[PDB]
Design an enzyme around this catalytic site. Sequence first.
Site, PDB file in Angstrom:
ATOM      1  N   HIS A  83       4.390   2.761   0.329  1.00  0.00           N
ATOM      2  CA  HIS A  83       2.641   2.633  -0.377  1.00  0.00           C
ATOM      3  C   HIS A  83       2.865   2.798  -1.303  1.00  0.00           C
ATOM      4  CE1 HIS A  83       1.945   5.495   3.782  1.00  0.00           C
ATOM      5  NE2 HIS A  83       1.025   5.173   3.759  1.00  0.00           N
ATOM      6  N   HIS A  87       2.111  -2.503  -0.983  1.00  0.00           N
ATOM      7  CA  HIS A  87       1.405  -2.827   0.461  1.00  0.00           C
ATOM      8  C   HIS A  87      -0.774  -2.879   0.561  1.00  0.00           C
ATOM      9  CE1 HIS A  87       0.120  -0.709   3.923  1.00  0.00           C
ATOM     10  NE2 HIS A  87      -1.230   0.359   3.004  1.00  0.00           N
ATOM     11  N   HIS A 123      -7.138   1.650  -1.362  1.00  0.00           N
ATOM     12  CA  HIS A 123      -7.232   3.093  -0.311  1.00  0.00           C
ATOM     13  C   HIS A 123      -5.754   3.684   0.078  1.00  0.00           C
ATOM     14  CE1 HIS A 123      -4.685  -0.007   1.822  1.00  0.00           C
ATOM     15  NE2 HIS A 123      -4.298   1.430   2.884  1.00  0.00           N
ATOM     16  N   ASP A 124      -4.734   3.313  -1.174  1.00  0.00           N
ATOM     17  CA  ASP A 124      -4.144   4.108  -1.474  1.00  0.00           C
ATOM     18  C   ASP A 124      -3.415   4.299  -3.035  1.00  0.00           C
ATOM     19  OD1 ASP A 124      -2.933   4.805   1.872  1.00  0.00           O
ATOM     20  OD2 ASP A 124      -1.973   2.564   1.959  1.00  0.00           O
ATOM     21  N   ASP A 241      -5.193  -1.981   7.824  1.00  0.00           N
ATOM     22  CA  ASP A 241      -4.062  -1.555   7.235  1.00  0.00           C
ATOM     23  C   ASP A 241      -2.559  -1.504   7.946  1.00  0.00           C
ATOM     24  OD1 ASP A 241      -4.175   0.695   5.120  1.00  0.00           O
ATOM     25  OD2 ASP A 241      -4.877   2.330   6.624  1.00  0.00           O
ATOM     26  N   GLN A 292       8.314   2.230  16.318  1.00  0.00           N
ATOM     27  CA  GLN A 292       7.945   0.721  16.550  1.00  0.00           C
ATOM     28  C   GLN A 292       7.351   0.368  17.846  1.00  0.00           C
ATOM     29  OE1 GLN A 292       6.830  -0.064  13.522  1.00  0.00           O
ATOM     30  NE2 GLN A 292       7.859   1.470  13.167  1.00  0.00           N
ATOM     31  N   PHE A 295       4.680   3.626  18.258  1.00  0.00           N
ATOM     32  CA  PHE A 295       3.705   2.847  17.078  1.00  0.00           C
ATOM     33  C   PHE A 295       2.668   2.332  18.029  1.00  0.00           C
ATOM     34  CE2 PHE A 295       1.964   1.445  13.114  1.00  0.00           C
ATOM     35  CZ  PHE A 295       0.951   2.797  13.344  1.00  0.00           C
TER      36      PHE A 295
HETATM   37  N1  LIG Z   1       5.146   0.049  10.867  1.00  0.00           N
HETATM   38  C1  LIG Z   1       5.049   1.703  10.940  1.00  0.00           C
HETATM   39  N2  LIG Z   1       5.443   1.583  12.265  1.00  0.00           N
HETATM   40  C2  LIG Z   1       5.101   3.604  12.084  1.00  0.00           C
HETATM   41  N3  LIG Z   1       4.176   3.740  11.367  1.00  0.00           N
HETATM   42  C3  LIG Z   1       3.752   3.052  10.543  1.00  0.00           C
HETATM   43  C4  LIG Z   1       3.962   1.479  10.320  1.00  0.00           C
HETATM   44  N4  LIG Z   1       3.136   0.674   9.292  1.00  0.00           N
HETATM   45  C5  LIG Z   1       2.022   2.212   9.004  1.00  0.00           C
HETATM   46  N5  LIG Z   1       2.831   3.267   9.092  1.00  0.00           N
HETATM   47  C6  LIG Z   1       1.878   4.395   9.184  1.00  0.00           C
HETATM   48  O1  LIG Z   1       0.474   4.177   9.407  1.00  0.00           O
HETATM   49  C7  LIG Z   1      -0.225   4.877   8.427  1.00  0.00           C
HETATM   50  C8  LIG Z   1      -1.503   4.661   7.912  1.00  0.00           C
HETATM   51  O2  LIG Z   1      -0.858   3.894   6.612  1.00  0.00           O
HETATM   52  P1  LIG Z   1      -1.602   4.155   5.766  1.00  0.00           P
HETATM   53  O3  LIG Z   1      -3.385   3.711   5.312  1.00  0.00           O
HETATM   54  O4  LIG Z   1      -1.219   2.799   4.421  1.00  0.00           O
HETATM   55  O5  LIG Z   1      -0.847   5.029   5.175  1.00  0.00           O
HETATM   56  C9  LIG Z   1       0.963   5.352   7.132  1.00  0.00           C
HETATM   57  O6  LIG Z   1       0.774   6.436   6.644  1.00  0.00           O
HETATM   58  C10 LIG Z   1       2.268   5.300   8.021  1.00  0.00           C
HETATM   59  O7  LIG Z   1       2.740   6.610   8.091  1.00  0.00           O
HETATM   60 ZN   LIG Z   2      -2.150   1.923   3.921  1.00  0.00          ZN
HETATM   61 ZN   LIG Z   3      -3.174   5.965   3.088  1.00  0.00          ZN
END
Ligand SMILES: Nc1ncnc2c1ncn2[C@@H]1O[C@H](COP(=O)(O)O)[C@@H](O)[C@H]1O
Ligand SMILES: [Zn+2]
Ligand SMILES: [Zn+2]
Length: 338
Positions: A83, A87, A123-124, A241, A292, A295
Amino acid sequence: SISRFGVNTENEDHLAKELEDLNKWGLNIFNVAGYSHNRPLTCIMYAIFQERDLLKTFRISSDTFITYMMTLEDHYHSDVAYHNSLHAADVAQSTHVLLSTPALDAVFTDLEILAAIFAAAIHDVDHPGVSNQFLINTNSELALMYNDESVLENHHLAVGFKLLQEEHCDIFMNLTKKQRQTLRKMVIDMVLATDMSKHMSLLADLKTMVETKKVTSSGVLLLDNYTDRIQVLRNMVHCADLSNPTKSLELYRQWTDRIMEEFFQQGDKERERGMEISPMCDKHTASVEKSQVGFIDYIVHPLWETWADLVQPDAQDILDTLEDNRNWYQSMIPQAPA
Ligand SMILES: Nc1ncnc2c1ncn2[C@@H]1O[C@H](COP(=O)(O)O)[C@@H](O)[C@H]1O
Ligand SMILES: [Zn+2]
Ligand SMILES: [Zn+2]
Protein backbone atom coordinates in the site's frame (compact mmCIF):
# COMPACT_ATOMS: atom_id res chain seq x y z
CA SER A 1 7.70 20.58 -15.15
CA ILE A 2 10.46 18.05 -15.77
CA SER A 3 12.65 20.02 -13.35
CA ARG A 4 10.20 19.62 -10.45
CA PHE A 5 10.65 15.88 -11.10
CA GLY A 6 14.44 16.20 -11.05
CA VAL A 7 14.63 14.05 -14.18
CA ASN A 8 17.40 14.50 -16.79
CA THR A 9 16.89 14.12 -20.56
CA GLU A 10 18.23 10.55 -20.57
CA ASN A 11 15.59 9.36 -18.11
CA GLU A 12 13.02 11.68 -19.65
CA ASP A 13 13.61 9.77 -22.89
CA HIS A 14 13.19 6.41 -21.11
CA LEU A 15 10.00 7.72 -19.52
CA ALA A 16 8.69 8.79 -22.92
CA LYS A 17 9.12 5.21 -24.14
CA GLU A 18 7.23 3.87 -21.11
CA LEU A 19 4.43 6.44 -21.37
CA GLU A 20 3.59 5.26 -24.89
CA ASP A 21 1.41 2.77 -22.99
CA LEU A 22 -0.35 5.42 -20.89
CA ASN A 23 -3.79 4.44 -22.18
CA LYS A 24 -3.04 0.70 -22.16
CA TRP A 25 -3.55 -2.06 -19.56
CA GLY A 26 -0.01 -3.19 -20.31
CA LEU A 27 1.69 -0.04 -19.01
CA ASN A 28 4.54 -0.98 -16.66
CA ILE A 29 4.29 1.34 -13.64
CA PHE A 30 7.37 -0.25 -12.05
CA ASN A 31 9.50 1.06 -14.92
CA VAL A 32 7.79 4.45 -14.56
CA ALA A 33 8.82 4.64 -10.89
CA GLY A 34 12.38 3.69 -11.85
CA TYR A 35 12.75 6.58 -14.29
CA SER A 36 11.01 9.24 -12.17
CA HIS A 37 13.06 9.12 -8.93
CA ASN A 38 10.34 6.90 -7.51
CA ARG A 39 7.53 9.43 -7.86
CA PRO A 40 5.25 7.16 -9.97
CA LEU A 41 1.96 8.59 -8.65
CA THR A 42 2.84 12.21 -9.45
CA CYS A 43 4.35 11.29 -12.82
CA ILE A 44 1.45 9.09 -13.95
CA MET A 45 -1.13 11.54 -12.61
CA TYR A 46 0.51 14.42 -14.45
CA ALA A 47 0.59 12.34 -17.65
CA ILE A 48 -3.08 11.39 -17.18
CA PHE A 49 -4.24 14.95 -16.53
CA GLN A 50 -2.30 16.20 -19.59
CA GLU A 51 -3.80 13.42 -21.72
CA ARG A 52 -7.37 14.32 -20.66
CA ASP A 53 -6.82 18.10 -20.66
CA LEU A 54 -8.10 18.13 -17.10
CA LEU A 55 -5.69 20.91 -16.06
CA LYS A 56 -7.10 23.16 -18.77
CA THR A 57 -10.72 22.22 -18.04
CA PHE A 58 -10.64 22.84 -14.28
CA ARG A 59 -8.08 25.63 -14.39
CA ILE A 60 -5.41 23.83 -12.38
CA SER A 61 -1.93 25.20 -13.02
CA SER A 62 0.93 22.72 -13.33
CA ASP A 63 2.45 24.39 -10.29
CA THR A 64 -0.50 23.74 -7.99
CA PHE A 65 -1.05 20.24 -9.40
CA ILE A 66 2.54 19.05 -9.01
CA THR A 67 2.85 20.64 -5.56
CA TYR A 68 -0.28 18.86 -4.35
CA MET A 69 0.59 15.54 -5.99
CA MET A 70 4.16 15.55 -4.68
CA THR A 71 2.75 16.29 -1.22
CA LEU A 72 0.13 13.55 -1.46
CA GLU A 73 2.66 11.01 -2.75
CA ASP A 74 4.95 11.80 0.16
CA HIS A 75 2.15 10.82 2.51
CA TYR A 76 2.13 7.27 1.15
CA HIS A 77 4.64 5.19 3.17
CA SER A 78 7.52 4.01 1.00
CA ASP A 79 8.37 1.35 3.60
CA VAL A 80 4.95 -0.33 3.33
CA ALA A 81 5.52 -3.11 0.75
CA TYR A 82 2.15 -2.96 -1.06
CA HIS A 83 0.00 0.00 0.00
CA ASN A 84 2.47 2.63 -1.18
CA SER A 85 2.43 5.27 -3.94
CA LEU A 86 3.36 2.69 -6.56
CA HIS A 87 0.05 0.89 -5.89
CA ALA A 88 -1.87 4.19 -5.94
CA ALA A 89 -0.26 5.10 -9.27
CA ASP A 90 -1.25 1.70 -10.69
CA VAL A 91 -4.84 2.15 -9.52
CA ALA A 92 -5.05 5.67 -10.93
CA GLN A 93 -3.66 4.56 -14.31
CA SER A 94 -5.97 1.52 -14.36
CA THR A 95 -8.97 3.74 -13.61
CA HIS A 96 -7.80 6.02 -16.42
CA VAL A 97 -7.94 3.11 -18.88
CA LEU A 98 -11.31 1.83 -17.63
CA LEU A 99 -12.84 5.29 -18.04
CA SER A 100 -12.02 5.06 -21.77
CA THR A 101 -13.72 1.70 -22.34
CA PRO A 102 -15.86 1.80 -25.54
CA ALA A 103 -19.05 0.79 -23.71
CA LEU A 104 -18.79 3.95 -21.57
CA ASP A 105 -17.90 6.49 -24.25
CA ALA A 106 -19.43 9.92 -23.60
CA VAL A 107 -21.24 8.65 -20.50
CA PHE A 108 -19.42 10.63 -17.78
CA THR A 109 -18.95 14.36 -17.32
CA ASP A 110 -15.46 15.84 -16.90
CA LEU A 111 -16.09 16.37 -13.17
CA GLU A 112 -17.00 12.71 -12.76
CA ILE A 113 -13.82 11.73 -14.62
CA LEU A 114 -11.80 14.08 -12.39
CA ALA A 115 -13.48 12.61 -9.31
CA ALA A 116 -12.73 8.96 -10.18
CA ILE A 117 -9.05 9.48 -10.98
CA PHE A 118 -8.57 11.67 -7.89
CA ALA A 119 -10.35 9.06 -5.78
CA ALA A 120 -8.00 6.40 -7.14
CA ALA A 121 -4.89 8.50 -6.39
CA ILE A 122 -5.80 9.21 -2.75
CA HIS A 123 -7.63 5.98 -1.87
CA ASP A 124 -4.79 4.46 0.26
CA VAL A 125 -2.87 7.57 1.35
CA ASP A 126 -1.06 7.30 4.70
CA HIS A 127 -1.76 3.57 4.89
CA PRO A 128 0.21 2.08 7.85
CA GLY A 129 0.62 -1.32 6.27
CA VAL A 130 -1.83 -3.01 8.66
CA SER A 131 -5.57 -3.77 8.48
CA ASN A 132 -8.52 -2.02 10.06
CA GLN A 133 -8.90 -4.94 12.47
CA PHE A 134 -5.27 -4.59 13.61
CA LEU A 135 -5.93 -0.91 14.40
CA ILE A 136 -9.13 -1.86 16.21
CA ASN A 137 -7.49 -4.61 18.28
CA THR A 138 -4.60 -2.38 19.41
CA ASN A 139 -7.00 0.36 20.51
CA SER A 140 -5.45 2.67 17.91
CA GLU A 141 -6.27 6.37 18.17
CA LEU A 142 -7.48 6.20 14.56
CA ALA A 143 -9.95 3.39 15.36
CA LEU A 144 -11.28 5.36 18.34
CA MET A 145 -11.75 8.46 16.18
CA TYR A 146 -13.72 6.60 13.51
CA ASN A 147 -15.65 4.27 15.81
CA ASP A 148 -14.13 1.12 14.27
CA GLU A 149 -15.99 1.75 10.95
CA SER A 150 -13.98 1.81 7.69
CA VAL A 151 -11.16 3.25 9.81
CA LEU A 152 -8.42 3.44 7.20
CA GLU A 153 -10.73 4.37 4.33
CA ASN A 154 -12.13 7.28 6.33
CA HIS A 155 -8.55 8.35 7.14
CA HIS A 156 -7.43 8.13 3.50
CA LEU A 157 -10.19 10.56 2.59
CA ALA A 158 -9.47 12.96 5.46
CA VAL A 159 -5.77 13.16 4.50
CA GLY A 160 -6.43 13.48 0.78
CA PHE A 161 -8.69 16.47 1.31
CA LYS A 162 -6.72 17.95 4.23
CA LEU A 163 -3.55 18.23 2.13
CA LEU A 164 -5.32 20.60 -0.27
CA GLN A 165 -4.85 23.19 2.45
CA GLU A 166 -1.05 23.13 2.42
CA GLU A 167 0.87 25.85 0.57
CA HIS A 168 -0.01 25.97 -3.17
CA CYS A 169 -1.90 22.66 -2.96
CA ASP A 170 -5.56 23.48 -3.69
CA ILE A 171 -6.13 21.87 -7.07
CA PHE A 172 -9.88 22.45 -6.67
CA MET A 173 -9.54 26.20 -6.08
CA ASN A 174 -11.18 27.18 -9.37
CA LEU A 175 -14.07 24.74 -9.33
CA THR A 176 -17.42 26.29 -8.48
CA LYS A 177 -18.82 25.75 -5.00
CA LYS A 178 -21.35 23.35 -6.54
CA GLN A 179 -18.68 21.41 -8.43
CA ARG A 180 -16.56 21.03 -5.28
CA GLN A 181 -19.59 19.79 -3.36
CA THR A 182 -20.44 17.23 -6.05
CA LEU A 183 -16.86 16.09 -6.49
CA ARG A 184 -16.42 15.64 -2.75
CA LYS A 185 -19.62 13.59 -2.49
CA MET A 186 -18.49 11.34 -5.34
CA VAL A 187 -14.92 10.94 -4.09
CA ILE A 188 -16.07 10.03 -0.59
CA ASP A 189 -18.50 7.50 -2.09
CA MET A 190 -15.83 5.82 -4.21
CA VAL A 191 -13.12 5.63 -1.53
CA LEU A 192 -15.42 4.27 1.16
CA ALA A 193 -16.36 1.65 -1.45
CA THR A 194 -12.79 0.31 -1.46
CA ASP A 195 -13.41 -1.17 2.00
CA MET A 196 -13.42 -4.92 1.31
CA SER A 197 -16.21 -5.39 3.85
CA LYS A 198 -18.51 -3.68 1.34
CA HIS A 199 -17.44 -5.90 -1.57
CA MET A 200 -20.34 -8.36 -1.49
CA SER A 201 -22.99 -5.64 -1.38
CA LEU A 202 -21.14 -3.84 -4.19
CA LEU A 203 -21.10 -6.91 -6.43
CA ALA A 204 -24.71 -7.77 -5.65
CA ASP A 205 -25.96 -4.29 -6.51
CA LEU A 206 -23.65 -4.33 -9.55
CA LYS A 207 -25.14 -7.54 -10.95
CA THR A 208 -28.63 -6.15 -10.37
CA MET A 209 -27.87 -3.07 -12.45
CA VAL A 210 -26.52 -5.30 -15.22
CA GLU A 211 -29.93 -7.00 -15.28
CA THR A 212 -31.51 -3.63 -16.08
CA LYS A 213 -28.59 -2.77 -18.38
CA LYS A 214 -29.63 -0.42 -21.20
CA VAL A 215 -27.59 0.38 -24.32
CA THR A 216 -27.88 2.47 -27.48
CA SER A 217 -27.67 2.19 -31.25
CA SER A 218 -23.97 1.28 -31.17
CA GLY A 219 -23.74 -0.65 -27.92
CA VAL A 220 -22.95 2.27 -25.61
CA LEU A 221 -24.40 1.94 -22.11
CA LEU A 222 -27.12 4.35 -20.99
CA LEU A 223 -26.96 5.91 -17.52
CA ASP A 224 -29.07 9.07 -17.32
CA ASN A 225 -29.33 9.43 -13.54
CA TYR A 226 -26.65 10.22 -10.95
CA THR A 227 -27.42 7.16 -8.83
CA ASP A 228 -26.64 4.83 -11.75
CA ARG A 229 -23.49 6.67 -12.80
CA ILE A 230 -22.01 6.76 -9.29
CA GLN A 231 -22.68 3.03 -8.88
CA VAL A 232 -20.63 2.39 -12.02
CA LEU A 233 -17.80 4.72 -10.97
CA ARG A 234 -17.80 3.18 -7.50
CA ASN A 235 -17.40 -0.29 -9.00
CA MET A 236 -14.93 0.95 -11.62
CA VAL A 237 -12.48 2.20 -8.98
CA HIS A 238 -13.05 -1.00 -7.00
CA CYS A 239 -12.13 -3.03 -10.08
CA ALA A 240 -9.00 -0.97 -10.72
CA ASP A 241 -8.07 -1.48 -7.07
CA LEU A 242 -8.44 -5.24 -7.60
CA SER A 243 -6.82 -5.30 -11.05
CA ASN A 244 -3.48 -6.89 -10.11
CA PRO A 245 -4.56 -10.45 -11.11
CA THR A 246 -5.73 -9.23 -14.52
CA LYS A 247 -2.35 -7.81 -15.55
CA SER A 248 0.44 -9.53 -17.47
CA LEU A 249 1.94 -12.17 -15.19
CA GLU A 250 5.26 -10.31 -14.95
CA LEU A 251 3.40 -7.46 -13.25
CA TYR A 252 0.91 -9.58 -11.26
CA ARG A 253 3.76 -11.55 -9.71
CA GLN A 254 5.46 -8.37 -8.49
CA TRP A 255 2.19 -7.19 -6.92
CA THR A 256 1.72 -10.58 -5.27
CA ASP A 257 5.25 -10.50 -3.83
CA ARG A 258 4.43 -7.10 -2.30
CA ILE A 259 1.04 -8.00 -0.88
CA MET A 260 2.60 -11.10 0.72
CA GLU A 261 5.51 -9.08 2.12
CA GLU A 262 3.06 -6.63 3.70
CA PHE A 263 0.95 -9.45 5.13
CA PHE A 264 4.04 -11.04 6.67
CA GLN A 265 5.13 -7.71 8.12
CA GLN A 266 1.77 -7.35 9.88
CA GLY A 267 2.25 -10.91 11.09
CA ASP A 268 5.59 -9.81 12.54
CA LYS A 269 3.95 -6.84 14.29
CA GLU A 270 1.26 -9.06 15.79
CA ARG A 271 3.93 -11.39 17.15
CA GLU A 272 6.01 -8.45 18.44
CA ARG A 273 3.04 -7.04 20.35
CA GLY A 274 1.91 -10.35 21.82
CA MET A 275 -1.19 -10.58 19.61
CA GLU A 276 -2.33 -13.75 17.87
CA ILE A 277 -1.26 -13.95 14.21
CA SER A 278 -3.81 -13.29 11.44
CA PRO A 279 -4.67 -15.59 8.48
CA MET A 280 -2.07 -15.24 5.70
CA CYS A 281 0.09 -13.05 7.95
CA ASP A 282 2.17 -16.05 9.04
CA LYS A 283 5.07 -16.41 6.58
CA HIS A 284 5.40 -20.02 7.75
CA THR A 285 1.78 -21.14 7.33
CA ALA A 286 0.66 -19.15 4.28
CA SER A 287 0.50 -20.64 0.79
CA VAL A 288 0.89 -17.89 -1.81
CA GLU A 289 -0.37 -20.04 -4.68
CA LYS A 290 -3.45 -21.28 -2.84
CA SER A 291 -4.19 -17.79 -1.53
CA GLN A 292 -4.13 -16.24 -5.00
CA VAL A 293 -6.36 -18.96 -6.47
CA GLY A 294 -8.81 -18.49 -3.62
CA PHE A 295 -8.72 -14.70 -3.95
CA ILE A 296 -9.51 -14.84 -7.66
CA ASP A 297 -12.23 -17.51 -7.53
CA TYR A 298 -14.12 -15.97 -4.61
CA ILE A 299 -13.54 -12.25 -5.19
CA VAL A 300 -11.65 -11.01 -8.23
CA HIS A 301 -13.16 -13.23 -10.94
CA PRO A 302 -16.74 -12.86 -9.70
CA LEU A 303 -16.16 -9.10 -9.79
CA TRP A 304 -14.50 -8.80 -13.19
CA GLU A 305 -16.96 -11.24 -14.77
CA THR A 306 -19.79 -8.92 -13.77
CA TRP A 307 -17.87 -5.87 -15.00
CA ALA A 308 -17.00 -7.67 -18.23
CA ASP A 309 -20.73 -8.32 -18.65
CA LEU A 310 -21.61 -4.65 -18.14
CA VAL A 311 -19.13 -3.51 -20.81
CA GLN A 312 -19.31 -6.53 -23.15
CA PRO A 313 -17.12 -7.21 -24.94
CA ASP A 314 -14.59 -4.53 -23.92
CA ALA A 315 -13.13 -6.51 -20.99
CA GLN A 316 -12.85 -9.94 -22.63
CA ASP A 317 -9.05 -9.77 -22.94
CA ILE A 318 -8.81 -8.81 -19.27
CA LEU A 319 -10.97 -11.78 -18.27
CA ASP A 320 -8.81 -14.14 -20.33
CA THR A 321 -5.57 -12.96 -18.72
CA LEU A 322 -7.21 -13.25 -15.32
CA GLU A 323 -8.13 -16.84 -16.11
CA ASP A 324 -4.66 -17.69 -17.42
CA ASN A 325 -3.04 -16.23 -14.30
CA ARG A 326 -5.52 -18.11 -12.12
CA ASN A 327 -4.65 -21.41 -13.79
CA TRP A 328 -0.94 -20.62 -13.66
CA TYR A 329 -1.12 -20.27 -9.88
CA GLN A 330 -3.40 -23.30 -9.69
CA SER A 331 -0.75 -25.47 -11.33
CA MET A 332 1.92 -23.74 -9.27
CA ILE A 333 0.50 -25.04 -6.00
CA PRO A 334 3.19 -27.35 -4.51
CA GLN A 335 2.58 -31.11 -4.41
CA ALA A 336 3.90 -33.72 -1.97
CA PRO A 337 3.02 -37.37 -2.79
CA ALA A 338 4.27 -40.32 -0.72
N1 LIG B 1 -3.10 -10.20 -5.28
C1 LIG B 1 -3.74 -10.13 -4.10
N2 LIG B 1 -3.80 -11.29 -3.32
C2 LIG B 1 -4.46 -11.26 -2.09
N3 LIG B 1 -5.06 -10.12 -1.60
C3 LIG B 1 -4.99 -8.96 -2.40
C4 LIG B 1 -4.32 -8.92 -3.68
N4 LIG B 1 -4.44 -7.65 -4.20
C5 LIG B 1 -5.14 -6.95 -3.27
N5 LIG B 1 -5.50 -7.69 -2.17
C6 LIG B 1 -6.26 -7.29 -0.95
O1 LIG B 1 -7.28 -6.37 -1.34
C7 LIG B 1 -7.44 -5.42 -0.31
C8 LIG B 1 -8.00 -4.09 -0.89
O2 LIG B 1 -6.99 -3.41 -1.63
P1 LIG B 1 -6.57 -1.95 -1.21
O3 LIG B 1 -7.60 -0.90 -1.53
O4 LIG B 1 -5.32 -1.62 -1.94
O5 LIG B 1 -6.37 -1.90 0.22
C9 LIG B 1 -6.04 -5.23 0.22
O6 LIG B 1 -6.10 -4.70 1.55
C10 LIG B 1 -5.42 -6.60 0.17
O7 LIG B 1 -5.57 -7.30 1.41
ZN1 LIG C 1 -5.65 0.09 -2.92
ZN1 LIG D 1 -7.58 0.24 0.97
